[PDB]
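User: We ran a pulldown and think these components assemble together. Before we commit to crystallization trials, I'd like a predicted model of the whole complex to look at. Sequences follow.
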Amino acid sequence: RYEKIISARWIITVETDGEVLENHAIAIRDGKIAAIIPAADAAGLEADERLELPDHVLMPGLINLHGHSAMSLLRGLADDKALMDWLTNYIWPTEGKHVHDDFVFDGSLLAMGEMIRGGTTTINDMYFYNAAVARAGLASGMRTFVGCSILEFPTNYASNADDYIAKGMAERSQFLGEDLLTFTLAPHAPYTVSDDTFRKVVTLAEQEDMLIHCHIHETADEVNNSVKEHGQRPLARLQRLGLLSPRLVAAHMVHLNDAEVELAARHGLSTAHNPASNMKLASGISPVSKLMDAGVAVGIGTDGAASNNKLDMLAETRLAALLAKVGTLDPTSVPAAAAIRMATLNGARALGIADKVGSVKVGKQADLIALDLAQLETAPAFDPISHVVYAAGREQVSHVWVKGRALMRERKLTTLDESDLKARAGDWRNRILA
Amino acid sequence: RYEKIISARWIITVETDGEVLENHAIAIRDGKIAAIIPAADAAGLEADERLELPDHVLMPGLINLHGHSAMSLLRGLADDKALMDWLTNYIWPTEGKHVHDDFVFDGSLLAMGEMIRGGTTTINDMYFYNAAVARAGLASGMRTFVGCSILEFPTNYASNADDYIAKGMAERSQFLGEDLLTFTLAPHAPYTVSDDTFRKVVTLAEQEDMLIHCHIHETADEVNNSVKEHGQRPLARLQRLGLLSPRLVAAHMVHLNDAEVELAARHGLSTAHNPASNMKLASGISPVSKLMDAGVAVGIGTDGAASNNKLDMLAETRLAALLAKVGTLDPTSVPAAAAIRMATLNGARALGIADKVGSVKVGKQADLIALDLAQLETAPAFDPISHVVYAAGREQVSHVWVKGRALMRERKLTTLDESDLKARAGDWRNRILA
Ligand SMILES: O=c1[nH]cnc2c1ncn2[C@@H]1O[C@H](CO)[C@@H](O)[C@H]1O
Ligand SMILES: O=c1[nH]cnc2c1ncn2[C@@H]1O[C@H](CO)[C@@H](O)[C@H]1O
Ligand SMILES: O=c1[nH]cnc2c1ncn2[C@@H]1O[C@H](CO)[C@@H](O)[C@H]1O
Ligand SMILES: O=c1[nH]cnc2c1ncn2[C@@H]1O[C@H](CO)[C@@H](O)[C@H]1O
Ligand SMILES: [Cl-]
Ligand SMILES: [Cl-]
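Assistant: Here's a predicted model for the assembly, 868 residues in total across the polymer chains.
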């Protein structure tokens, strides 16, 4: 028997741009999409649960390809600074004061509540105290990628690059065989990681078959300083070190010349486009249309809540579409169908799981969300693809499933206690202002 | 006796950047802010109504300085086109088919429901069938500026420029002595209005003491074509015609050289910055920091729902702050306090009513909104100014007052029927797709 049959007014499949099924239903078995049928054929089938969603659009869950989830606890603490000043003089000192297992667990949980509330099903995270992020991920039920940050300087978490690596690998070993939990290696950035450390990461990632998650080409200063310090721009350096390959998720990728776009395409890396953070830190505009035209998977992330300051993937996807048009002065850059692809299927491609999630397709896992379009904000309900990108908001997501399992139903969180999340945030407000 | 005393956790006054009152209350009498006192002193005072808003921020209502409200009915019908193509081949033909009194009334009402829901208290509108916009404005209770559009070409509404003017003035005469309703003259744009029509508008606006509301310098094509057709860029032409003065609200103002920034400052015009529409139509980035540094009142508008596609002033204000930083590559451009000023006090300045609304100040009219910050999206609650701009969403506005009168309470609309609005939208969906 089917576990669930969910019928909706619209289904955006993301299998082909523009494809929207009307009055169809999704049958779910063993956590996967087992059938996609006219809703009329669905009552004749048996199911453990049945759900009718009139005036709702069903679509793949949104994939946040770049977050620092625990930074939810620092929301609004460090505005109006460019990247290096922001890290050096505000973020790193605050992180030195407050970041331990407790912070990371509490902050990750808070972030996950906010993400589920806005229709995010997968988070590609990157932080410290990775066992705490993993624990939070198993608790929330989100599809979770835990990025083990690697730096050269000592922190409360680890004393040197080898220690970040050893601790990440030790923590990874405590969460083996978890279908929805995946550890990655996350060397922080070209300007905080040495050639030797990058080589160790390449070797380890290859041996253990892990993704590499790294902030790359975020600022002009990073790129220009790299030439001075390493003799070439960061991408060329990383190519020399062996880092560019399909396992690499390159966050930001704001400052690129045309040769670097082709380099990315040839090595089959993916990028995470984080428009709010790129604007807020005054980093610049990633040439996402050029990357996508070259065949590169460009997903979308939010970055952390201290440089956004939302974890809202619908808002982030709209912003990607708007910024692409203003940056190219071409109104046909990133149409709504492409933006949805960025927020879903391209994220899955980046994470090496596009055969598993990212579209509404029989055989794929049921990572799905439903948006209630019967609100003034999305009225009249003409084209749901257009509305999802340009009009709908995080507040309209009504239901969230990961592998067929409900994480939210009629905006009630089913795996996390929303009151508990608010209380942890209030605790941290007191502790940080202390 | 006070009509209302509203106590809140935070009050953002907008009287000085950064000023936030904690645990204070606003006493309202005769539609105006009569006192701002510590909340402890408030129970000792008598009031017809008392309201406690723990974890809420109270602030001035948001002022949408540029809308085409009835276009709510066209939401998502015309994406991925640049301005002239969009108007010529999509918008104007659709407007020729569907726009009459009924469309404008229904569409304005729908827009007003969405605007109130997101904390907008004043709308500077610009459309056709102005008596219908006026009627909708009196119904909703919003502070409403009705912009009587003037074009040269015949439409269902009017046959020539003189007819747009005569009809607007006739309709204005039916709504005299309304405190919350103000008619303006709205010549459409430099490229749709002749020198003779502009002169008639200058003369009429002076005689009747009316504001002038006009789309100016929206695109590079407009500015370059003006030189060919009129011998000078549009602002210089309008200066020659007498249009630049404090009564002018110049919408868009995207393509400006430094001489035009100073011209604007010298004539004391204001601009409406409409970032989503400027990005979506691929028009460009208005140099709002330069204008503001020169002393020009720069407010924020949404434009119409077919080029946004939201009427969300919180989202529009965040976008203004983000776009300013990425466009100048200066993270200190448009800090959150300045963005709030743009969305409130600068709108009031533009509309010539900054002595009346736009800040929380004794003697001013009680155009106020309350946002519930006790949500995951704005947790932890550190600085409410930062959160309002970078984290809070339209869904968190709980209460709206215009002149002390509640237009929304705990997200229930008090002057409009939300079900009726949804039904009109559904009616129009059917009629437009027919
Ligand atoms: O946009 C960013 N660029 C570079 N570093 C960042 C950004 N956001 C957060 N972090 C920092 O990266 C570390 C986790 O890998 C943390 O120190 C976090 O504060
Ligand atoms: O555009 C794509 N379509 C399908 N799969 C893709 C695409 N790009 C990368 N992959 C990757 O190919 C493998 C088999 O599906 C998976 O690793 C998937 O992520
Ligand atoms: O961003 C814009 N620029 C120019 N015209 C516009 C824009 N948005 C809507 N209209 C058009 O202006 C008229 C009302 O004055 C309407 O025809 C409307 O469709
Ligand atoms: O920065 C300002 N502060 C106060 N009033 C202003 C400002 N700019 C323009 N006005 C205008 O001056 C008159 C008296 O207050 C009003 O017309 C108001 O809108
Ligand atoms: Cl080195
Ligand atoms: Cl002329």
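The radius of gyration of chain B is 21 Å. That may be worth checking against your pulldown data before setting up trials.

User: Thanks, that helps.
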